[PDB]
Each structure stands twice: as C-alpha cells, then as structure tokens.
Design an enzyme around this catalytic site. Structure first.
Site, mmCIF file in Angstrom:
data_model
loop_
_atom_site.group_PDB
_atom_site.id
_atom_site.type_symbol
_atom_site.label_atom_id
_atom_site.label_comp_id
_atom_site.label_asym_id
_atom_site.label_seq_id
_atom_site.Cartn_x
_atom_site.Cartn_y
_atom_site.Cartn_z
ATOM 1 C CG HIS B 351 -2.249 -0.815 1.026
ATOM 2 N ND1 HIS B 351 -3.317 -0.462 0.279
ATOM 3 C CD2 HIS B 351 -2.187 -2.025 1.469
ATOM 4 C CE1 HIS B 351 -4.088 -1.389 0.195
ATOM 5 N NE2 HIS B 351 -3.667 -2.557 0.907
ATOM 6 C CE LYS B 542 -5.538 13.380 -0.037
ATOM 7 N NZ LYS B 542 -6.724 13.209 -0.986
ATOM 8 N NE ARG B 543 -5.614 9.935 9.875
ATOM 9 C CZ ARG B 543 -5.445 9.005 10.552
ATOM 10 N NH1 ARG B 543 -5.946 7.999 10.415
ATOM 11 N NH2 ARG B 543 -4.294 9.154 11.435
ATOM 12 C CE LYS B 548 -3.111 10.848 2.902
ATOM 13 N NZ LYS B 548 -3.827 10.060 1.583
ATOM 14 C CB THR B 650 -9.792 4.933 -2.412
ATOM 15 O OG1 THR B 650 -9.825 5.194 -1.183
ATOM 16 C CG2 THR B 650 -9.025 3.643 -2.937
ATOM 17 C CE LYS B 654 -13.704 6.918 -0.731
ATOM 18 N NZ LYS B 654 -13.269 7.014 0.441
#
Ligand SMILES: O=c1oc2c(O)c(O)cc3c(=O)oc4c(O)c(O)cc1c4c23
Ligand SMILES: O=c1oc2c(O)c(O)cc3c(=O)oc4c(O)c(O)cc1c4c23
Ligand SMILES: *Cc1c(COP(=O)(O)O)cnc(C)c1O
Ligand SMILES: *Cc1c(COP(=O)(O)O)cnc(C)c1O
Lengths: 810, 810
Positions: B351, B542-543, B548, B650, B654
């Site tokens: 992952h 998102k986290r 990120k 992911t 969405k």
C-alpha cells in the site's frame, strides 16, 4: 404433566412452538442442523421473556398513573440464581413450555441446566434480597431492587487435591437474555475532589467522574401480572477520560473496575478502597434516580410519603449522608428539614452481631475519596451527641460509646451507628437477634430511642423453595388442600389433619425417596461418586465459617467412624454426610476446614470395614442452583451455630419446607421454628445464649473437655498424629491448636450433647412411619417462614404501605 | 419516491410496520410514549436485520453444499461506516422502509443520523477492505473478512482553540444490532513461552493463553441474495487466568487489552508490543478457523485449491510463519511440502513506498513474544538466500539487501521481504505504484521472481459511493441508461451520448446545486457556520500528512487572500475552501498543519474586504459518514500529493464518480483517471516522478524558490512574523523551518504551477455549461474505478476463481 405446573392448552403450545422457531431463526441466526443445546436454551429463554414484556410495560405504566409510595431496596448483593424456571412458574407457563419443547423433540430439564446462575451474592444476605424481590412483586408493592451489575459474581469453587481453588465466574460470557441495558438513563457519580465554601454554602469540586449505566431485569410476581424492576448499575468511563493516546484509552479500565467483581467476604469486613467505591457508586446513582422519579410527579416535605429506602446491612449506609448532601448542597434545604426528611425516608436492617463483620471505615479513606460526606458525617455526629448529652447529662462514657467517630490508632467511622442515627427504623432478622441488639451491642441506642427498634423475622419464597425445586411435594400438598397455599403459606397448617392419614404418609415418604434417587443419580453423572440412596441424608450446606461449626459436624463424623471400627459387626443406621459451601479466598481457617472434610472422606469412604454404612461427601461449588437440588433430597438439616452467633439463618427454613428434620442449637430462627413445630418435633441440643455467657464469665477452657471425654481425646490424637494426613502428619496442627487454645465458638462444649442428640435422630430414622409423621408436623407449621409474611410486616410496620393480592389485567 | 430506491408495495410496507412495532415492544421494551428517536432507529435496524438472516443462513448453507474455493481477506482495519442505509440499498428496501416509517409519523433520514460509524480503520487501506467486502458479495464469491473487533475505533476529533483534541470513540456504547456473538467458536491464542526440541520436532510450551471470541457481521451483495460474513475477533482471558483473588480478577484486563483500541497511525510504523500482539492475535485465530473449515470437507495438497489468503499490507504477515508452524509442528508435514502449500495459498498487497511506513520488527520483541515464529523466519530466510546465491553467484550486496533479517544497532525483521518470499503474488494498487515497486524498492525481488509481481488498481463500491450518498445523481443517470450500471459501472460510458444534451446538462448541474444547498444547511445546523452556496466548493478531505500536501493548499489559500487585499475591487470567482482530516495523536507536524488551517480561517473569514468571496473551513471529525455528505457537494477535488508518494488514493475516485473536477499531480491512480477521462478533462499540474528524481539528484534547495517568487516570499514572511498568530508571533516557526530547510515533499517546487492551474479552474467555473460538460466526461469514464473491476481481477489473476452475477433464490 402435574397440576401446579399450569395448563397446556393447544393454542398456547402452538404459539410457544412458533415463537421458539422464530427466535432460533431471527434472534440466534441458526437452523436446526447447526443448533447446539445452548442455542435451544436461548430460544426458550427469549420465548418466555416475550411473555414478561407486556406485563412489565403495563406494571410500570400503572405505577406512573397511580403514583403509589415507592419502595427502594438497596443491596450490594442480589443472589438470584437461574431465571428461566422461576419465570415459567410465576407466569403459569411450565407445563405449556414442557409440552411445546417435548413436541419439538427436546427435554426442557436439560435446557434449564444450561443457564448460568446470577451469583451476585455471597450467602444469606444476598439470597434474602432475592426472596424479598419475589415477595414484593407477589404482594403488588411498587418496589425496585437497586444494586451493582458485577461482571464476575461469586467465584466458581473447584476442589483440587482436597483444597479449594477459585475460578472467575464469567457468568455474562454467553450473554444475559433477561437484562435490558438502559444507556439512556446513564448518570454521573463523583469521586475525590475537595470542598469549597462560598457565600452560598459548600461546593464539591475538582471531582473525578464515573458514569453509572443501568441494566433492568424484570421481577415477576406469582400469577398476578405484576412485573417489578431490579436495576443494576455498571461503571463506565466518560469519553474524554484521561484525554499518550493509547495508554489513556487503556486506563479507562481503572474507572470501570468499580463494577468488575463481587467481594467474596461473608460476614467479614475488609476495609479496601475499591469496596468503598462500590458502596458509594450504588448509593449515588440510585439516589439521583430516586429524586428524578420523585420530581416527575421542590416540595421535599412529601418526599417520605412517596419514598422508602431500605438499607440491606450497612453496605449502602452512605445513602444517609448522600441524601443530606443532595438536599442541603444542591436543593438548598436547611439542615433540620433535610435531616427530618432523611430519617423518615431511611430504614436499616442489621444482619450480624459478630464484631469482625461491622463496617468501620478509616477516616483517611473517606477524607480522600468523599471529603464532603466526611464533613456531613461529622456534623451528624455532633448533633446526635448533643442529643445524647441532653438525655443523659454527665454520662461521658456513653458519649464515647455512641459516637459515630471511633478513637484509636486509626480514627474510624462506625457505619452501624450512622445507620441508627439516620433511620426511623432499625430491625434484626429473628426474635432472638433483635433482643440481643437491644440488650448488648445497641443497648445505648435502644435507651435513647426505644421506638426505632423492631424485629422482622427472615423468610424464604415458597415459589423458588417449594414449587420450583420440589414439584412432587407441591403436588401431593395441592391434591389435599388446593393451590392457594403457594401465595398464603399459613394454609399449610391444614396438613395437620393428615398426620394420621396412611395415604398422605406414604406420599410424603415416596416424594422424599424420589428426590433422593434423583440427587444420587446427579452425583454419579456429574461427579463420578457413588452413594447409597437408602441411607439417611445428613446435610450441612452454607458458607464455611468457624461460627457455623462445620468442625462440630466433622467431630461427629469421626466419632461415628471410630465407633464402627471398634464394633464392626454392630448395626448402625447408614448415613450419607454431605457438607458443602465456599470459603472466602483469604480465610485460611475456613480453607483448612474444607481440606479436613475431604481428608476425612479419603479415609472413611475407602475403608472396607465401613462398607456403605458411612459416606462423607464434600459438595463442590455450592450455589443457588445446587441448593435447589440438594435441599429436596435431605433427611437431616444441620443448623449447629454457637448460640447467639447466627442472626437468623434462611437455609434452616428451606430444609423445613422440604421435608427434612432439623438438628440445631437454640440460635437465630431455629428458636421460632421449634416454637412453631413444637420442641418435641425438633432435635434441639447444646448451650443456650445464657449458657454461653456463663461459660464466658468463668472462662472457656477446652482442655477440661479433652480431659473428661475419652472419645473426644482420641479424635484430637488422630488429628494431631497424622491419621487423616499420613504424608503430612502435622497438616492439621492449626485446627488442633485453635480448638485447644483459642476457639471463640466453643466446639468442645457442645460435643457431648450433639453426639447424644444425633443418636436420637438415628433411633427415629429406624421407624420410617414415625419419622414421616414428624416431617409432616414440620412442613405443616413452616408457614410463618414465608418471605410474604416478612414483607407484609415490613410494608405495614416500616414502609407504611398496604400489600395487595389483587391481579393487574393480563 | 425515486426509482433506484426500489418498490414500496402495500404488502411490504404493512409487514415492515408490523415488525417495527413488534421490535419496539418486544426487543426494545418501550411503548410510543417513552420512545426516543434512538429507540426508533434501533426498531428500524432490527426490522431490516430480520431480512438479512434468511439469506445469510442460506448463503452459508450454499457454500457448505457446493464447497467452492474460499477467499480469506485478512486486515487489521475494516472502515465500515454506517450499516442501515447500505443494507436497505442492497436489499431493495429503501423506498418501502421510507414509506413504512413515514406512515408511522417518522423521518427515516433523521433515524439514519443516529447510527454510529463502525470506524475500525484509519483511512484508505481500511476503507479499501470495506469496499472489497461489498464487491466480493456482489460478485458471488465465497469470501470472509477477518479482523479485530476493536472496542474503540478511530478517535473522535474535536477542534478546541484551533487545535485537534482526541476523544475515545465508544461506538459500542448503545449496542451493535448488526453483529452476532459466536462464543461457541472461541479459540485459544498463545503468547510468550519457549521452544522445546524432542525426537518428534519442536514444541512450543509454557505459553500464556488468550481466547479469541468471534463476532459475525453480515455482508449483503447488491440485490443477488448473497450474504457473506465479516468475522471480527475479541480478546477474552481464560477463567483460571492469574488463578490475591480480587487483583487476579482485575488483571484479566491485561489479556483483553489486545482488542481494546485501534492504533491511529496512517502510513507510519510504530514498533510497540501491543500492536504486535494484535497482529498475531488476528492471524492465529483466523488460521485455526480456516483449517477447521478446510478439514470439514489430512491431505493438505488440496489446501491451495480450497483456500486463498489475501494479506492487506504486511500487518497480517505473521500468517506466513504461522501457517508453516501449524503445518510442520502440528500436522507433521515436511518443510518443503508445507512451504509449497504456504506460497500457493498466500498473496500480498503493498500500500505504500514511504520508508517510515514499512514494518521492521525488532528481533528481541519476536524472540520474547513469538520464539517459534522467529525460528521459522530464520529458516525461511536461510533457504530464500540460498536461492538468491544460486541465481546471482558472488553478488554479496544483493544477499544483504534481500535478507529478511536487517543488520544494525538493533536487528530487525523486514515484514515486506517476508511477504514477498512467502506469497505467489505481490501487487501494488495503481499502475504507477506497481511500476515503482519493480524499479526501486523491490527491484531485487522482481529480478529473482518476475512472475510474482502484479498490478491491481484500486476501486470504490458504486453502491455506497453513488447510490447511497448521491441518490439524485444515480436517478438522473438511471432515467437515461437504466439501472444495470450499479453493478456494471462500465455502462456509464453510455453517458458520453448526452454531453451535448441540454436537458441532461441542466439535470447534472441541478443535482450538484441541491447537494451543495443540503451540505450548506448541514454546516449551519450542526456547526453554527455560514457558507455561500453559489461559490466553488474546493475540497481536500483525507488524513493529514506532509506527503498529501495540505500545506500546498494552504499556500494557495493565502495567495488568493493576498491578491484580494491587493486589488479588493477586482472580480474573483468566489470559493469555499474546505479541508478536513485527522492527524495521528503523536504526529506533531500534522497537528501544526491543522492549527495553521484554522488560523488562516480566523483571518480570512472575518476580513470585511474579503466578504463572501473566500471562506476557509476546517471540516471536523472527517470519517466515512461525513465523506458521504461532503463528496456529493464538491466542485473541485484536491489530489495534490508529491509525484511518487500516494500509492493509489481512493478519495480521488469517489469525487470523480460524484461530479467534481480534479486538480492533481500525476500520482497514484490520478494517472489512470486522467487517461480514462482525457487529459484535457483534468486539471494536471506539477512535477512528474522523473522531475522529482532529477531534483533529488541535484539537491532540493527551497531558498531558490523563495528568492525567485515574490508572492511565495510574502506568505513566508507573513507566517514567520505572526500575521496568522498575533498573540504568539512564532507559533508557526516549525512549519516555516521545515518548508525552508527539510521539506521531504518539495512543496515550493510545485507552488507556481499549482497557482497557475488553479486560475484555469476559476476560468472554467465562470462558464457553467462548459464546466458541467467536462463533469459529464468525468462521470462517464469513471467505470474503471469500480471495486467490482478490481475484485474480478483479483479473483481471476490471483485467487483463481470465477466471479458470478447470478442470484441465489430469495
Ligand atoms: O484474614 C482473614 O481472617 C478472617 C477471620 O479470622 C474470620 O473469622 C473470618 C473471615 C472471613 O469470613 O472472610 C475473610 C476474607 O474474605 C479475607 O480476605 C481474609 C480474612 C477473612 C476472615
Ligand atoms: O513521532 C512521529 O513522527 C511522525 C512523522 O515524522 C511522520 O512523517 C508521520 C507520522 C505519522 O503518520 O504518524 C505518527 C504517529 O501516529 C505517532 O504516534 C508518532 C509519529 C507519527 C509520524
Ligand atoms: C439459603 C442460602 C444460604 C444461606 O444459608 P444459611 O444456612 O442460612 O447460612 C447460603 N447460600 C445459598 C446458595 C443459599 O441458597
Ligand atoms: C476514501 C476515504 C479515505 C481515503 O482517501 P484518500 O484521499 O485516498 O487518502 C480516507 N478516509 C475516509 C473516511 C474515506 O472515505
């Protein structure tokens, strides 16, 4: 099958079967191919539970509309046992469920054995609370039981190498179908912190908060459609508790430990902080719930007209300063008004006179944990002692004796003194016990306020303790006198008319024989041990304690053994001696007593000369469901506490109802039982309370008995020399030493009279007809010992409410 | 009301109403007068659950008869969210339940909001497992999800003074109606102990035992009557555990702590003992359950023909040595045969490539906790390295690089290397990620065994992520192309025929406006904050992580603010910038990033010159149920990780399904999304992986960007000087220092291209018709990103099973 077990109508049987299959499918998520007997038990439990809910909702709705005075029974123990059969009995469903399950190819008795006991008590005090809930529902009182939902109840007892081992009683493992969680009525409970004084009185601040989550269990009355509530509190941490991160989450268990485990002490005070937390936790959550319910009906003058709080022992004694705290600090009532309300609301039941059982909490503990309650207790004390000083001027020793604060190495609060000061009623649990309270330990309090002191003799519920556990006996009785006695036990007196009835004599004796065969079969299948069903079943079941004198029973057993060995070819009445009960894990002497019983068994049961003339069995893991099996099977009930030590007893009453004769001292309720049946129909022996007092004044010298009784000397020599422990000759030195030098309970002093009395038992047992006739006289006069009588007396003389036998609509 | 939500037949509605009232009465023990909305939620949940059980029993019975190959998906995380609506969707019950509840006087949407999320995951990896279970059921696979029933899931996030605070997620407080405890299938798990060698191989002895109790949750397929199982293990102490007495009972929590709390780390390895215990606990209980099920059908040759085990990351990597332990030590297979079986059974999904996320367990930990597994790991390593040596003779550095044992200060086991050696398949989660695996971090392994390495691009379930959360969009699509796309998402390609359809353009734009109004209303009612519904909804959820690059988004926000302040009377496209996500409690930089976002909000949202032209909102407590609300409301999706760091993503998928355009780097699945839609229909900016590599070889110097970009310099000066923190001028010094001197993720390097790309977004948004047309092109090409496609590829290329769209009988 049998009439007392109700109707099995075609409509009801069909409906029960449908609902059983529905629960198996939808509730348990199983089909018949994968289902275990445990699944079948759960399908039945849910089916029976469904029949309660309508009546439960309607009962609570009824109390809302009618607004009667509510009774709150506060106890740290509710020794409930199993619920399935009791529910069926009270709802008149037993035969229908029996039929329905038979048709589904199942044995209901087998399914009943799967249910775990709710073992949330230690012994007498806990089981009394359970019997009381049953009677209060049966008598239509608006009553609520309040306690703690312990995750682990009384430990499961295993015997390994003759020694007690303790295992966690994980009774909730498979779920509890009877309870309903009510997380919506969760309440905060405060601990620690400090007291702040404002211009507006005291404030309790900087507290640690623990949540109290209630779980409700239905309590069905006997065939009256009344279903009351037992509300048990579970400890939960708040969600911001301790809020590195992982550890803060794991540390939630610190708060939730409050409701984790029942303290396994029976009639013994252990001054541990966690126990004090449990006591405050139950009290604080309960009182908030009481006040909430009261307000949904600021005039606290009417509070004692709508609320009674019964304290089961001193365990919930903190209800008194907590009620004061709420009324004064939160509701802003003046002290005197709050005190009047408190006294009129609260009543206290004492369960023992033994000094080591009395709760005497260190001041330093209360100071840290409950600083506001300590201040309130000091204020109560000062005002109470001012009244004492005015009534008995210059009597300075009385002041010291009556104080709630005990002076010494460590300052302590006497919780019993707090309960007397703060209650309008104080009761003992049998006539002799209530008299002892007035004459000795509470003499000073009785002189100050004579009107507070009452007797309420204990009782047992004839639902669980006759109909449920002994259907064969309930039926032969019903055949002659009808069914009304089940909720009016005084009607058993009609059985005196059948004492010379040959048919009835034969039926009583047949029911006993059947009970004995069934129990003999139980012992083989479950414990791989063989007993002769023709022998006299000699039974002592109760918690192991020095005061209860299982040791005296042991001495008799050894005497019988020695007499057989001396004259092998002489006839003796065959006996099975059965002793069972748990010892508290820290109670060394009680643990040694268990080891002695098994060691005696090891010798006696394997001696070929004895044969099947004498057998000694220790009944493992004695608990409510075992009591329901062994009591109907007993011939002789051992109730042999030293006079003045057993406040009442209730096991004694269970045996009397079930057709055993009693060998006992004039102690506790034994006195009233003998008075009801006639002394000639009882096996009474030993010192009276007055004889014990006389011996104490002179000084008890055990050596004297040893010197004068050759049979006693031989037993002591056998014990000392290693006869019962060949591989460890000094194993029982602690026992011998205690008996010879520091026996608080005067075992030797009653030995000769006990042995002689036991010979008279053996003589009567040789004549079955006359044995059975005496049995009939016992059963027929057991009516006084129904907890329905006890509760009616509490209701009228303490709570100020009238019991009702009237049915609610179905 | 709307067609995709199913039929509301009179018979079904009547039946649902009856069953609702039955559960309220019998299950919840309430009447309508005392019932809270929570009770109504529970009555509905039990009513819907009833419809699952028949299909659940029949599905599991079907697998018993047919004996297909079973798929076991092992994950430490299942990020499930709410269950009620998902169950109704998959059973075609939504309209009927809506009707039934409306008729009872209730709003179903209100009842849905009462359900707690099952927040048993951190982010992407956990939610992937949940989407996968849904697809596996929908595709008729005999699949089982296995994990841990955490008592506390991912913490609830509160924002206090702009800072994240963590609260325990006590999600089981009110009960979980979806689970069924299965205490009958409880299994022992062993810890600690030592290895004994006999003449009959190794024995693992003197272990501490913890029980694993399973709870089963139904997993319904989409309208095919398939109901699979998710089995989650709970830790229980044995009853003789530690068996003074009280303490031994309280110490049971030590064993039960294993299943207490989810580790809140996302893409970060924390080498704590309790985490290792959780990993072994899930593996050991699961494998026993697998073998038990296999044997009910000693020939382990057929084991890989009947069993596939999928490892979700390395978290359950201990499955490999545990399978070896069981086959060799218990079943007595020879090593080589056991190894063949193991390799053929196991497959591993990677992952992330971030080094700090890789599990590297200290040898000393495994030595104490799992001594036999360490021996097995050493033996695997020796045999694996022998193969490496034979393939690449004399290449000593390769041997060191490929070893499962890492040398150093502390010796460690590389769990990723263990997974590759012991699996027949290794996959990455997007094409670019799978290529990076082969080129960089697993290059050596790829050269040895090229055939093991696969790609399986991630996907999302169109049930939860379209039909459930965006019924308005699902309906307008169904009107044109029918309903078949819901389980065959490739059919969305038919929507390209409507790109010039004026009616469809208007409907797509109307559905978005309605979603935005509903979300704007949600924010006011629940968080007392006002937003302009006509603004562009610019969303990054998102986290919180440095990779990120929420920080890059912050820089753009500040740039927009500075441009407005410089030219107040110039027109700009109004924006609502929404950022949400949780930070791990120990992740200081991520916590500082959250504080920055709120601090920017404090300035921007209260500046009168700005007006309603720019708003910055931090969305508190981002979780699955919040995603279902915010994603349908978004216009612009922020997918801005540094190229080569986000393995797939992911959330990106969405947003694409729900009618937002994407601004993003060529990272993870963004590459495939742009390829599907056409690059012209995507907002791509920034460095590619190759550009990052080039910058790394030269050396990243942030000062250069600061020196050359005046707008960037001003932002840094504002941050440093206390513009966004007037009362603590140096509050953000850590952030400034990281950006200037040790930014692993090259925030500044993408700043100019990002700002310019954002201008192009604003330009397109000014032309609603052309915006919507581009949106249509995105929705129409999102079909590849259905988890049904992903799972069909796993089934065919890894597990060796054929998916089925065929219905089981109802
Ligand atoms: O140390 C103890 O001494 C005792 C006595 O001396 C006694 O007469 C009765 C008891 C009793 O009933 O329960 C006990 C416990 O539960 C415990 O943990 C410790 C003790 C006792 C105990
Ligand atoms: O000390 C930490 O440093 C980190 C980093 O330097 C980083 O880049 C990412 C992370 C991250 O994702 O999760 C974390 C945790 O859950 C935690 O308890 C501690 C840390 C980190 C962490
Ligand atoms: C009735 C009962 C007791 C009390 O028995 P006594 O002989 O009065 O001490 C204790 N334990 C159990 C399980 C009971 O049913
Ligand atoms: C989809 C999802 C994620 C993963 O989002 P990414 O942007 O791919 O990291 C995380 N959390 C929740 C609650 C989700 O629904």
């Amino acid at each position: 099958q049998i009439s007392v077990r109700g109707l099995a109508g075609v409509e009801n049987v069909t409906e029960l079967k449908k609902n059983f299959n529905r629960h198996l499918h939808f509730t348990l998520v199983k089909d018949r191919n994968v289902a275990t007997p445990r699944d079948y038990y759960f399908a039945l439990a849910h089916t029976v539970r469904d029949h309660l809910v309508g009546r439960w909702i309607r009962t609570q709705q009824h109390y809302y509309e009618k607004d009667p005075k509510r009774i709150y029974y506060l106890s740290l123990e509710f020794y409930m046992g199993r619920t399935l059969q009791n529910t069926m009995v009270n709802l008149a469903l037993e035969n229908a469920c029996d039929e329905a399950t038979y048709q589904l190819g199942l044995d209901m008795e087998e399914l009943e054995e799967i249910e775990e006991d709710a073992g949330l008590g230690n012994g007498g005090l806990g089981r009394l609370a359970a019997c009381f809930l049953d009677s209060m529902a049966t008598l239509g009182l608006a009553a609520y039981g309040y306690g703690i939902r312990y995750e682990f109840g009384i430990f499961n007892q295993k015997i390994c190498g003759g020694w007690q081992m303790e295992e966690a009683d994980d009774w909730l493992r498979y779920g509890n179908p009877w309870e309903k969680a009510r997380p919506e009525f969760t309440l905060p409970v405060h601990f620690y912190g400090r007291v702040e004084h404002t211009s507006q009185g005291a404030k309790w601040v900087d507290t640690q908060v623990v949540l109290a989550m209630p779980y409700d269990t239905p309590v069905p009355g006997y065939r009256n459609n009344v279903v009351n509530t037992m509300r048990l509190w579970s400890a939960k941490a708040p969600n911001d508790f301790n809020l590195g991160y992982i550890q803060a989450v794991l540390d939630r268990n610190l708060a939730e430990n409050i409701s984790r485990v029942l303290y396994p002490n029976d009639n013994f005070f252990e001054g541990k902080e966690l126990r004090l937390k449990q006591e405050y936790f139950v009290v604080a959550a309960t009182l908030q719930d009481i006040i909430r319910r009261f307000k949904s009906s600021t005039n606290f003058d009417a509070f004692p007209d709508k609320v009674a709080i019964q304290l089961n022992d001193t365990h919930p004694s903190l209800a008194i300063p907590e009620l004061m705290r709420v009324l004064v600090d939160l509701e802003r009532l003046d002290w005197d008004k709050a005190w009047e309300v408190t006294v009129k609301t609260c009543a206290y039941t004492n369960h023992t006179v033994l000094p080591e059982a009395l709760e005497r909490w260190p001041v330093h503990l209360l100071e840290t944990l409950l600083p506001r309650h300590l201040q309130i207790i000091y204020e109560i004390n000062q005002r109470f002692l001012n009244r004492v000083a005015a009534a008995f001027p210059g009597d300075v020793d009385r002041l010291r004796r009556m104080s709630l604060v005990e002076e010494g190495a460590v300052k302590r609060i006497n919780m019993a003194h707090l309960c007397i000061a703060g209650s309008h009623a104080v009761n003992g649990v049998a006539r002799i016990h209530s008299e002892i309270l007035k004459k000795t330990i509470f003499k000073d309090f009785y002189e100050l306020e004579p009107h507070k002191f009452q007797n309420k003799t204990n009782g047992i519920t004839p639902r669980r303790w006759l109909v449920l556990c002994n259907p064969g006996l309930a039926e032969i009785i019903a055949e002659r006198i009808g069914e009304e006695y089940i909720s009016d036990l005084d009607q058993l007196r009609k059985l005196l008319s059948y004492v010379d009835d040959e048919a009835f004599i034969r039926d009583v004796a047949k029911v006993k024989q059947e009970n004995k065969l069934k129990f003999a079969a139980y012992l083989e299948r479950e414990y791989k041990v063989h007993i002769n069903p023709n022998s006299l079943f000699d039974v002592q079941v109760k918690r192991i304690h020095e005061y209860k004198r299982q040791l005296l029973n042991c001495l008799h057993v050894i005497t019988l053994y020695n007499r057989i060995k001396k004259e092998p070819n002489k006839f003796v009445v065959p006996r099975t001696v059965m002793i069972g009960g748990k010892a508290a894990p820290g109670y060394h002497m009680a643990k040694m007593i268990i080891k002695l019983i098994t060691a005696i068994g090891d010798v006696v049961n394997h001696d070929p000369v004895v044969g099947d003339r004498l057998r000694v069995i220790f009944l493992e893991n004695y608990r409510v469901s075992l009591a329901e099996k062994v009591i109907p099977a007993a011939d002789l009930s051992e109730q042999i506490s030293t006079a003045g030590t057993e406040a009442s007893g209730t096991g004694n009453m269970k045996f009397m109802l079930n057709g055993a004769l009693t060998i006992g001292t004039m102690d506790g309720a034994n006195v009233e039982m003998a008075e009801e049946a006639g002394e000639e129909n009882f096996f009474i022996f030993g010192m009276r309370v007055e004889d014990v007092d006389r011996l104490d004044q002179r000084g008890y010298n055990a050596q004297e008995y040893y010197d004068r009784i050759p049979e006693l000397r031989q037993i002591i020599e056998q014990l000392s020399s290693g006869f019962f422990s060949p591989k460890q000759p000094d194993l029982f030195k602690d026992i011998v030493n205690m008996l010879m030098h520091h026996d608080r309970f005067k075992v030797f002093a009653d030995y000769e009279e006990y042995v002689k009395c036991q010979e008279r038992v053996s003589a009567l047992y040789k004549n079955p007809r006359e044995w059975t006739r005496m049995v009939i006289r016992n059963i027929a006069t057991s009516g006084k010992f129904s907890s329905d009588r006890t509760i009616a007396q509490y209701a009228r003389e303490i709570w100020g409410v009238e019991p009702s036998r009237q049915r609610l609509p179905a």
